Curated annotation (Swiss-Prot):
Belongs to the calycin superfamily. Fatty-acid binding protein (FABP) family. Pfam families: Lipocalin. This is Retinol-binding protein 1. GO terms for biological process: fatty acid transport; lipid homeostasis; lipid storage; maintenance of location in cell; regulation of granulocyte differentiation; response to benzoic acid; response to retinoic acid; response to vitamin A. GO terms for molecular function: all-trans-retinol binding; fatty acid binding; retinal binding; retinol binding. GO terms for cellular component: cell body; cytosol; lipid droplet; nucleus.
């Protein structure tokens, strides 16, 4: 019961500000990012899955190779570089980053027509709820 191939827009954020603080994002970026709420458009195609991000500010596409490893340069976010992998624990999805800090390792869980998840970073939890647009 997982089908990413669709359209998902962000509704709100309860810790997008606090999460920006973990990576020590500028005061300007935090300001701009507040009004911003990128819309993700996933395109599943086998073992290759691309997660779009179109905020009309700066395009940051990634190539999530399910089960396989790939680097991930976070330059544009908070200027970072690491190695990320993704697994399928079960009904949920779980991505682990072999970087620094203590938290960097995403987790997900879909619950219908709203792509919910639990972002983690440096011990901080960021709940960002995305809704299907269909
Ligand atoms: C702060 C900030 C941004 C947030 C970027 C992030 C954090 C994207 C998330 C990537 C992940 C974690 C993907 C795993 O599926 C963007 C550039 C987009 C817009 C303005 C500045």
């Amino acid at each position: 019961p997982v089908d990413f191939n669709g359209y998902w827009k962000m509704l709100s954020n309860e810790n997008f500000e606090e999460y920006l603080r973990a990576l020590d994002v500028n005061v300007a970026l935090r300001k701009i990012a507040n009004l911003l709420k990128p819309d993700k458009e996933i395109v599943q195609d086998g073992d290759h899955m691309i997660i779009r991000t179109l905020s009309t500010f700066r395009n940051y596409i990634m190539d999530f190779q399910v089960g396989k490893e790939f680097e991930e340069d976070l330059t544009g976010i908070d200027d970072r570089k690491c190695m990320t992998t993704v697994s399928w624990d079960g009904d949920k999805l779980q991505c682990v980053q072999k970087g620094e800090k203590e938290g960097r390792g995403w987790t997900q869980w879909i619950e219908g027509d709203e792509l919910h998840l639990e972002m983690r970073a440096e011990g901080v939890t960021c709940k960002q709820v995305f809704k299907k647009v269909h």
